[PDB]
Design a protein around this ligand. Sequence first.
Ligand SMILES: Nc1ncnc2c1ncn2[C@@H]1O[C@H](COP(=O)(O)OP(=O)(O)O)[C@@H](O)[C@H]1O
Ligand SMILES: [Mg+2]
Length: 206
Amino acid sequence: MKVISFLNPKGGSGKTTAVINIATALSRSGYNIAVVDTDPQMSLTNWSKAGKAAFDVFTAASEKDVYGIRKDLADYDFAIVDGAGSLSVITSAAVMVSDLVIIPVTPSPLDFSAAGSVVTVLEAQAYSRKVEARFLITRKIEMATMLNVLKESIKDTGVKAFRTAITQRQVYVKSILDGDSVFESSDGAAKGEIEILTKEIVRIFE
Ligand SMILES: Nc1ncnc2c1ncn2[C@@H]1O[C@H](COP(=O)(O)OP(=O)(O)O)[C@@H](O)[C@H]1O
Ligand SMILES: [Mg+2]
């Protein structure tokens, strides 16, 4: 089993949106997926109350639930962790049990510092214990042609970003409100980037 966490204390960085759609993409590909919500607000948990998730959902009530992830979800192929809104104990717990940490970050030059705070935690571990990490660019508006500012900031951390960025689309907002994913919509563009993005994630473990 492999553990993937989507971490960034910054609210609205796209963690939950990414988790739902990527978890769905993985399930569609034949993987056995479990998603663990560690957010006190339980956005993902509530979303799953509609009962339309193509994967199993779990709600971490404390850091202890995150520690036992490798034992409790050993039967799954991937356990995907949806992050919280602060660099608390629950966040550190997520880092420690992860095989891969994905840092959703938008092109906002003012909000990059939040994503960088997660890198600081990751960079604290020894090389022999270093967790694999990637930036995932999210909420990128369609008219964006070249994000050199974001590129420089990312380059400065040393952590690589996925090639595929999650674009800003209302379908991402509507689907979650209906308790579904983009794979239940008619937006073929949204489904496309999520599919290619997922392939990149998989390739990391293959
Ligand atoms: N790719 C996107 N396209 C359009 N709106 C988005 C996108 N990602 C996030 N949002 C909007 O911003 C909110 C924050 O996303 P959410 O996944 O809950 O973030 P985190 O999980 O960062 O708090 C959503 O409820 C939605 O309104
Ligand atoms: Mg969230």
